Amino acid sequence: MLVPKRVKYRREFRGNMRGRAKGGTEVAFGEYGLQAVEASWITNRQIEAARIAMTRYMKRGGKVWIKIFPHKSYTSKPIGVRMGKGKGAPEGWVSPVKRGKIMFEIAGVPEDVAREALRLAAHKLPVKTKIVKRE
Amino acid sequence: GSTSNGRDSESKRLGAKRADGQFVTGGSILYRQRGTKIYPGTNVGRGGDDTLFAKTDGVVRFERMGRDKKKVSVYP
Amino acid sequence: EKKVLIVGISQKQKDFDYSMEELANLAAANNMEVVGEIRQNIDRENRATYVGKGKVDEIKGLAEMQDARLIIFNDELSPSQIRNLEEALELDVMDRTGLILAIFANRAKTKEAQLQVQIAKLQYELPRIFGQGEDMDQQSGKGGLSNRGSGEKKIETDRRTIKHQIRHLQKELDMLVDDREVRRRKRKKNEIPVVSLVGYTNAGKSTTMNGLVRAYSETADKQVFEKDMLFATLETSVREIVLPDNKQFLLTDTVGFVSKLPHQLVKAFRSTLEEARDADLLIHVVDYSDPHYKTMMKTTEETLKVVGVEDVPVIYAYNKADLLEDEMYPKQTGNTIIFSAREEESLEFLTEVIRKELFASYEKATFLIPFEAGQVVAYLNEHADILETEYLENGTQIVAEVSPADLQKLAEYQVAE
RNA sequence: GGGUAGCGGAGAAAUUCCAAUCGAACUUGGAGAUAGCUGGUUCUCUCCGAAAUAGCUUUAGGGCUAGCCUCGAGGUAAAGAGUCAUGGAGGUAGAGCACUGUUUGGACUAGGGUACCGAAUUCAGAUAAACUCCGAAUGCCAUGUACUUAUACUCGGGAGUCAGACUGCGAGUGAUAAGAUCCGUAGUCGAAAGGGAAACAGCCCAGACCACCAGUUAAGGUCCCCAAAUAUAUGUUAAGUGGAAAAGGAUGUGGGGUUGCUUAGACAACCAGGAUGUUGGCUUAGAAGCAGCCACCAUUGAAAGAGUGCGUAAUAGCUCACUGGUCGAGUGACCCCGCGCCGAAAAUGUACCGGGGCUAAACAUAUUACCGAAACUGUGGAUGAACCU
RNA sequence: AUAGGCCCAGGCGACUGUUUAGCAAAAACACAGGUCUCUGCAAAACCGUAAGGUGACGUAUAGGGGCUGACGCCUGCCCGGU
RNA sequence: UCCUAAGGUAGCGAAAUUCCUUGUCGGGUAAGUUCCGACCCGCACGAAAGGCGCAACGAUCUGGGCACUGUCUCAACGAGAGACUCGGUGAAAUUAUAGUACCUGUGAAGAUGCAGGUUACCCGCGACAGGACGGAAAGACCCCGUGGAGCUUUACUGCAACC
RNA sequence: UGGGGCGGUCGCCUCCUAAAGAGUAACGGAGGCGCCCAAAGGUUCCCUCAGAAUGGAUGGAAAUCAUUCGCAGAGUGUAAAGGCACAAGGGAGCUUGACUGCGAGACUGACAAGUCGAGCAGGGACGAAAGUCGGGCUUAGUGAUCCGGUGGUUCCGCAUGGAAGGGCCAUCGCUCAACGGAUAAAAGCUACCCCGGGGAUAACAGGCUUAUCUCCCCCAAGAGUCCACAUCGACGGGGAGGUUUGGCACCUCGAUGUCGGCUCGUCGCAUCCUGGGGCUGUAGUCGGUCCCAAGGGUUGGGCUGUUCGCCCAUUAAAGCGGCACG
RNA sequence: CUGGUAGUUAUGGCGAGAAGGUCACACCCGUUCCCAUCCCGAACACGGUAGUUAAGCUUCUCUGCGCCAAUGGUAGUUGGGGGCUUCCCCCUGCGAGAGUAGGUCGCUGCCGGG
Numbered sequence A: 001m002l003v004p005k006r007v008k009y010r011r012e013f014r015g016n017m018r019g020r021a022k023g024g025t026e027v028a029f030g031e032y033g034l035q036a037v038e039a040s041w042i043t044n045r046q047i048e049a050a051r052i053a054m055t056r057y058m059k060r061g062g063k064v065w066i067k068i069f070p071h072k073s074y075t076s077k078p079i080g081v082r083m084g085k086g087k088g089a090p091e092g093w094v095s096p097v098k099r100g101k102i103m104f105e106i107a108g109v110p111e112d113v114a115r116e117a118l119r120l121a122a123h124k125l126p127v128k129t130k131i132v133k134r135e
Numbered sequence B: 001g002s003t004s005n006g007r008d009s010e011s012k013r014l015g016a017k018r019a020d021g022q023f024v025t026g027g028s029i030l031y032r033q034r035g036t037k038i039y040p041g042t043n044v045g046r047g048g049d050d051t052l053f054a055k056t057d058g059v060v061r062f063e064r065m066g067r068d069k070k071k072v073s074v075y076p
Numbered sequence C: 001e002k003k004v005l006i007v008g009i010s011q012k013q014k015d016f017d018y019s020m021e022e023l024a025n026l027a028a029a030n031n032m033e034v035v036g037e038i039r040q041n042i043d044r045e046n047r048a049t050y051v052g053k054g055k056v057d058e059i060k061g062l063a064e065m066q067d068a069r070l071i072i073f074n075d076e077l078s079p080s081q082i083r084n085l086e087e088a089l090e091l092d093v094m095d096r097t098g099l100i101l102a103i104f105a106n107r108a109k110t111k112e113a114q115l116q117v118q119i120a121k122l123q124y125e126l127p128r129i130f131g132q133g134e135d136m137d138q139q140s141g142k143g144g145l146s147n148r149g150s151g152e153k154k155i156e157t158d159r160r161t162i163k164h165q166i167r168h169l170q171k172e173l174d175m176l177v178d179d180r181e182v183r184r185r186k187r188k189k190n191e192i193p194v195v196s197l198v199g200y201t202n203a204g205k206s207t208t209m210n211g212l213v214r215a216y217s218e219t220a221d222k223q224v225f226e227k228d229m230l231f232a233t234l235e236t237s238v239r240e241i242v243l244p245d246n247k248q249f250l251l252t253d254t255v256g257f258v259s260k261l262p263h264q265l266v267k268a269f270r271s272t273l274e275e276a277r278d279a280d281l282l283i284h285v286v287d288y289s290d291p292h293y294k295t296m297m298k299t300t301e302e303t304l305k306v307v308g309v310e311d312v313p314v315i316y317a318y319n320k321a322d323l324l325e326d327e328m329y330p331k332q333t334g335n336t337i338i339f340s341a342r343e344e345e346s347l348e349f350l351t352e353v354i355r356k357e358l359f360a361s362y363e364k365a366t367f368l369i370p371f372e373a374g375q376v377v378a379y380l381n382e383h384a385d386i387l388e389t390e391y392l393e394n395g396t397q398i399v400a401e402v403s404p405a406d407l408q409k410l411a412e413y414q415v416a417e
Numbered sequence D: 001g002g003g004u005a006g007c008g009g010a011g012a013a014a015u016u017c018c019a020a021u022c023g024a025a026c027u028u029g030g031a032g033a034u035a036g037c038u039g040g041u042u043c044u045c046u047c048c049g050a051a052a053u054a055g056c057u058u059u060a061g062g063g064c065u066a067g068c069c070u071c072g073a074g075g076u077a078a079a080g081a082g083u084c085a086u087g088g089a090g091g092u093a094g095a096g097c098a099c100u101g102u103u104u105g106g107a108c109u110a111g112g113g114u115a116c117c118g119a120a121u122u123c124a125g126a127u128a129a130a131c132u133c134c135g136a137a138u139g140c141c142a143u144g145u146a147c148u149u150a151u152a153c154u155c156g157g158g159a160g161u162c163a164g165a166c167u168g169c170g171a172g173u174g175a176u177a178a179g180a181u182c183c184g185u186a187g188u189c190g191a192a193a194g195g196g197a198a199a200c201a202g203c204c205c206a207g208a209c210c211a212c213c214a215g216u217u218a219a220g221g222u223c224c225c226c227a228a229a230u231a232u233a234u235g236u237u238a239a240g241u242g243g244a245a246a247a248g249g250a251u252g253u254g255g256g257g258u259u260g261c262u263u264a265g266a267c268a269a270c271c272a273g274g275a276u277g278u279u280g281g282c283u284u285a286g287a288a289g290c291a292g293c294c295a296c297c298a299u300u301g302a303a304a305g306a307g308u309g310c311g312u313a314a315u316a317g318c319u320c321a322c323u324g325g326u327c328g329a330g331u332g333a334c335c336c337c338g339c340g341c342c343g344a345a346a347a348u349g350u351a352c353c354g355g356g357g358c359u360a361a362a363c364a365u366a367u368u369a370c371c372g373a374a375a376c377u378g379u380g381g382a383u384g385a386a387c388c389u
Numbered sequence E: 001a002u003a004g005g006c007c008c009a010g011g012c013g014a015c016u017g018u019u020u021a022g023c024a025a026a027a028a029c030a031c032a033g034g035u036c037u038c039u040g041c042a043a044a045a046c047c048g049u050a051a052g053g054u055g056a057c058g059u060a061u062a063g064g065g066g067c068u069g070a071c072g073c074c075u076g077c078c079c080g081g082u
Numbered sequence F: 001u002c003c004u005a006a007g008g009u010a011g012c013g014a015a016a017u018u019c020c021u022u023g024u025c026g027g028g029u030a031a032g033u034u035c036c037g038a039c040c041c042g043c044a045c046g047a048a049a050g051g052c053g054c055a056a057c058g059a060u061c062u063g064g065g066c067a068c069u070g071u072c073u074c075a076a077c078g079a080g081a082g083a084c085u086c087g088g089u090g091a092a093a094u095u096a097u098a099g100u101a102c103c104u105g106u107g108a109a110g111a112u113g114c115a116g117g118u119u120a121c122c123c124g125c126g127a128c129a130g131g132a133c134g135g136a137a138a139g140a141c142c143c144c145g146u147g148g149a150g151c152u153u154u155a156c157u158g159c160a161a162c163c
Numbered sequence G: 001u002g003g004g005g006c007g008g009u010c011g012c013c014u015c016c017u018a019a020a021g022a023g024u025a026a027c028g029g030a031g032g033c034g035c036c037c038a039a040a041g042g043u044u045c046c047c048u049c050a051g052a053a054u055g056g057a058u059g060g061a062a063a064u065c066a067u068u069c070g071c072a073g074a075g076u077g078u079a080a081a082g083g084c085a086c087a088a089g090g091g092a093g094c095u096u097g098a099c100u101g102c103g104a105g106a107c108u109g110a111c112a113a114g115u116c117g118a119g120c121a122g123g124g125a126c127g128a129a130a131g132u133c134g135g136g137c138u139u140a141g142u143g144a145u146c147c148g149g150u151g152g153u154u155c156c157g158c159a160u161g162g163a164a165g166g167g168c169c170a171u172c173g174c175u176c177a178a179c180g181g182a183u184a185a186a187a188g189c190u191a192c193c194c195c196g197g198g199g200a201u202a203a204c205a206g207g208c209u210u211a212u213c214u215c216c217c218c219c220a221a222g223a224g225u226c227c228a229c230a231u232c233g234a235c236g237g238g239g240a241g242g243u244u245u246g247g248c249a250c251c252u253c254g255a256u257g258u259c260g261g262c263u264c265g266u267c268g269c270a271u272c273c274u275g276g277g278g279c280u281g282u283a284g285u286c287g288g289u290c291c292c293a294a295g296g297g298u299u300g301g302g303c304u305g306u307u308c309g310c311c312c313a314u315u316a317a318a319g320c321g322g323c324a325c326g
Numbered sequence H: 001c002u003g004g005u006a007g008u009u010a011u012g013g014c015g016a017g018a019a020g021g022u023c024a025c026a027c028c029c030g031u032u033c034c035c036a037u038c039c040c041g042a043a044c045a046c047g048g049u050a051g052u053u054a055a056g057c058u059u060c061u062c063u064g065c066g067c068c069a070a071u072g073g074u075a076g077u078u079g080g081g082g083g084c085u086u087c088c089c090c091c092u093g094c095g096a097g098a099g100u101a102g103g104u105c106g107c108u109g110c111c112g113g114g
């Protein structure tokens, strides 16, 4: 699973996800891509599952791109611990995706199997998506 | 089950202390800083810890020296 | 890759070095690497700290100078031992049971296996609630005559909670067991012989089944897993085999075994060994290129007896006989086979072995199918081994061998010479 | 009948007994001990009117100084407030890769033994509270001769307060939970009645000196309970949606666009045809369009496939694509939008519009009247301050 | 009318006895027995500021204190620390 | 072979002592988390805080059996004393004023009293206890107070006593 | 102090939170300090770094040499931020201003304290001169009062002269670190406990939330003798409920009785039996799954205080939950 | 025409190519003294012009790098109002960053010579 090799600080703020995507709002590498319509956090587990289900249908033919990466980390507390006494220990890694950001790319396959592969990927992500193509 | 943080210093009240165009008495402080964010211009001297004061009575004028620097001056 | 130690004591075992190396292999399987092997030869395990008063210091020093985090012990520890070791070594501890549960919890890729692993882990962690809660029981609010505070004790409340959340999974596993026999209904109604395979990990069971399936199965695309990692196959798979003489039976593969398996997990595999429990021919694939093969074989028999497989025709099949230099394979002695499951002679050899074992009531009997009445020529071609056929003016003459069910099913068509 | 007396006596030992009292008897005195703790504190009207914060504290439910209220008295280069014009300090929102971390895909392997690199160059594309080549809106400081408006400041007498709450916006901790906790900013409650939210301190409108069987409006409303539109014009919904809840599923319904075919006859139906080499080859006991693999032709003809689905173990038989005819007005394929449907389960009794009830008395756009408060106005009274005569 | 239910096996305490008036009758206290130790008589110990007393009108086979608790078999190693 | 003053001897051992634990095997029972006999893996038995046994004794604690029975399956009848009606005498705890319903909701988050509906002629007698967060006792549990008291010691400072 | 205790912390400096002036909290996210330097201070004069490539070397990837490129990619006693190449960085010559008395005026600020300062006088260092120098590129490296010790003094000195003693200036003695320091001097048990208060603050029950828990679904890799969807369904995703383990601390401490059993029940349906039906890997018998359905029914014993659980024997069946865990 | 000496945000710089010169300015020669090198007359210091425009310096050309820079649109946002509230929409005022049309091989002051 995609994790950073090392980080400067182990703890980070939750942040916010308001506004349009700063960059990457268009397809540049492949010819089809999944575009987010809403905004939500995407963990690294959902990136992996949406990728195996995406290359398995393509039978390992053609190249896919991952346009997002889980830079930020989040923490959690055990059950039975009261509030306070510091901060929790990190658990996973997330990538806050604002609306209008392409998350995947497809090239090297015909029209029929490009849309179907993207369709199976979208069902594993918690955001409402749309299949978009280049020009 | 504990935190090793929880330490901070005491704020030093930095920043400007007189405004542009305001008549100022000699010997008064104009700008408290660390290092040299603003250079002393005419009738202005920099102290031991880089506080710009006024040497003569006059009018404070913040003004721009060469492309990437600032200075403060006092004009009678 | 985590850095760990490996500790074990002899305690009157007959397999000390092999079990130690097996623990090393198991640790290497869990993406865990070893940086020290401490072995003590004490007769009886120390009641308080598994190893001993003095050996703890040696373990502590070696782990301190070897940069290791977790220590993996060779046997399950009582809660007092867990607390004492974790408090003296000021690090974490873990036994064989916890390690193998973690291995299974990661290799499980189905709902049944996951539920079984979860129930076994919960049962494992049931005795340690005392030490889990002692720290908060030393400061459990305390006091005295509350006159309004509950009616029980903290430890007993924790036991009630854990038992309440364990019987639910017990009921769910009972329901799952009842479910698993619905898919067996069609096999049960039609009496078809089944050949089930058992053995020790990496003995070649999956490779044997894959070779047979590629040899005879119509759906040759249907294959099985095959890898060198511990516990590659964790779920049983059934395949239907069609020998060229139009004979039918099924062939099933099972998960493998390891030494000193926890008794909690064998209760869970009691279900996964149902297919071998009710079988016709067994094959016990014993490795023949590993010197502790006698130990592994016997361990297989004790595990099978624990499950409840007995009074079953067993055919032993030693594998990997290519590796051994100057050996005659394929061979056959008594009920023992020497072969390698990667060649087109050993496989076919074992096929006629199974043909001898299973089908032995296929007596031959001539038939005279009426010429008009079709649908019987076809039936006596896909369910028999037709020796010769003849054509007459009053019908057709068939000579072949069929099951004793067919001798009475089609008794009238036979004609005596 | 006697002995042991409270800093004491007895105790086969239980903190056991010493006048219904014993981890230290009863009575009087010091004594109105002390209580940063709880309770209580008695007549009326007029004017003004807070705080629940900072600092320190054996300090945290206490106190002291400052902040916030009230009374009195002073001095003017009138110093307070709002807006306007002008001048400034400061790196947030946004954005960006020019530095530092994180990171994707390609060309790229001087040299280690080709990422396994010690790695570096370059192209393209991302990312940041503790990154910045940049950088607003507001806020803040000051000058003015601007226009408007009433406070500021100093000295002195008297206090109370230092448990705050919710709502909108910007953050932290939490799980981007809590009527949670902790800050900044504005409002209301506290200390605020009145009208609307059914009832409902904090939400919306709005600040009660007294009297009136007078009028105009605000939020919210006008079928009945209940004052005022069963109002006007143009459309949507059929779900009681309106009046609860997602991923996902769907020939519900209305409005636009792009298009094929068609009165030299479109779709749908009805009639007829639907074949020859030939059972194509291989594999099979068996493979004739239809167990499986290989090219998938020519022929009659305007049509018929080396056969679209049934069927025979397999032949047989059924059927379709396509063609001709029969009658004669429209039919087939995508995109966008509005309103709707399913997903939809809990415990005393309908019980997720206040009720009745509604197919508008629901929703969208626009327009006009009215009801509606202690608000504002009208009439008559009582009163405080300032300034005048 | 008045007048023992019995039997098998185990833990504790040897037994009769004493105890929390008014929640606990006991496996707790005591006990005959064991052992250590102090005391030569104006004894040690205890009450009292002292005088005066108990011990005792006793004498070491006597008197005060600590632990164990019939009876049977036993009571192991350590004198560095206090 | 390292350290220590020395490294737990005999006798017992899932125990009034075992967390894991309903340890494991055997007995008793149709079925025995308690009981009895064994094993030793004694968290954390052990020799005058005595170790291991032990006839007699016990309103001691524990397990089993015979006899017996309304303890029970499952309750039925009868006697007396209260209760109940009449004559005599005649209190108490409690109490803001009360013409003192149900449901769903609201509210200081659990309403006879608020909102919307549903029910309900006025006054009593014998019974039952769901509510009046029913009565009694300024919660003992918990926390607080620079409150108190009793007890301990290699806490501070002292006194008696003795050398 | 998200009840108290165990754990951790208590004073000072730097950054983020901090919402573009200043200030701004939390048992919020990261680090340092309780010094060092006799030159690591002053002044005058001079110059410039890291790294890389190239050729020769004992000598290697990296030691010293030459050239080229090189706006800081180095350095600045030490942590971070701000700053500095017209040096605040690096060399050399001379020195002790790391001086005495002060100080218009400002910053910060409740107080006690803390910070900057042109300029005047006395007497100097460096420099030809103009001039610079009241420690260090700036911001941490420190604690009052009382009481004692040491040095000085044109102060007082209980009738007078002295003296003892005190005063004034300079300086020394604190892990008073709980760092605005109660005293020169200080640890525990209470289940034998007592008083004044509190729902300002915990244990039962109610309330908000739904991480966890129960149940229901979406996609579909796979299993199921071929066969995703008879029956299951991984890696992932979305909800309903308020029975579990939790979080908060809103009512109750001038008393809301707290487990299990007994008697008595009533309600929900996510149905254990019985009733009707669709699919089936439904030949028959026996079953599996789903839809409608709450009318009635839903056992007696052994072990344990037990809820639960295991076991013996039955039954058409031996349901799951709410009602202050009725 | 040139040698000094200042101001001005690099539109003023970098890089590239050409022309020129003893009247200046430099390159250059030598080390006696003043002075000098952790060694070195390289630099500094001193004494002169045998030689030279190949360097520095002056003039001319550029858009290759750099620098400066609109208009329009967009993000954001004060005030007011709405929602289906991880957030989103409407009216008025302010208004970037990036990208771009475009500009740039400098502009002024004093003194001495030719």
Ligand SMILES: Nc1nc2c(ncn2[C@@H]2O[C@H](COP(=O)(O)OP(=O)(O)CP(=O)(O)O)[C@@H](O)[C@H]2O)c(=O)[nH]1
Binding pocket: C200, C201, C202, C203, C204, C205, C206, C207, C208, C225, C226, C227, C228, C230, C231, C232, C233, C234, C254, C255, C256, C257, C319, C320, C321, C322, C323, C339, C340, C341, C342
């Ligand atoms: N030398 C040799 N190697 C063999 C033989 N059979 C199998 N192997 C190898 O050993 C490896 C073990 O795989 P295999 O034994 O099939 O897996 P498995 O035993 O089914 C794993 P599990 O038993 O847990 O299901 C295989 O990769 C195969 O290449 C043999 O006969 N000889």
Ligand SMILES: [Mg+2]
Binding pocket: B009, B010, B011, B012
């Ligand atoms: Mg600071």
Ligand SMILES: [Mg+2]
Binding pocket: B048
């Ligand atoms: Mg200085």
Ligand SMILES: [Mg+2]
Binding pocket: B048
């Ligand atoms: Mg200084």
Ligand SMILES: [Mg+2]
Binding pocket: B067, H009, H010
């Ligand atoms: Mg510039």
Ligand SMILES: [Mg+2]
Binding pocket: C142, C143, C144
């Ligand atoms: Mg207690």
Ligand SMILES: [Mg+2]
Binding pocket: C205, C206, C225, C226, C232, C233, C253
């Ligand atoms: Mg396998």
Ligand SMILES: [Mg+2]
Binding pocket: none
């Ligand atoms: Mg006494």
Ligand SMILES: [Mg+2]
Binding pocket: none
């Ligand atoms: Mg008593």
Ligand SMILES: [Mg+2]
Binding pocket: none
């Ligand atoms: Mg006691």
Ligand SMILES: [Mg+2]
Binding pocket: D011, D016
């Ligand atoms: Mg007594």
Ligand SMILES: [Mg+2]
Binding pocket: none
């Ligand atoms: Mg008494």
Ligand SMILES: [Mg+2]
Binding pocket: none
């Ligand atoms: Mg007195």
Ligand SMILES: [Mg+2]
Binding pocket: D034, F147
């Ligand atoms: Mg007192």
Ligand SMILES: [Mg+2]
Binding pocket: none
């Ligand atoms: Mg007023």
Ligand SMILES: [Mg+2]
Binding pocket: D061, D163
């Ligand atoms: Mg108060």
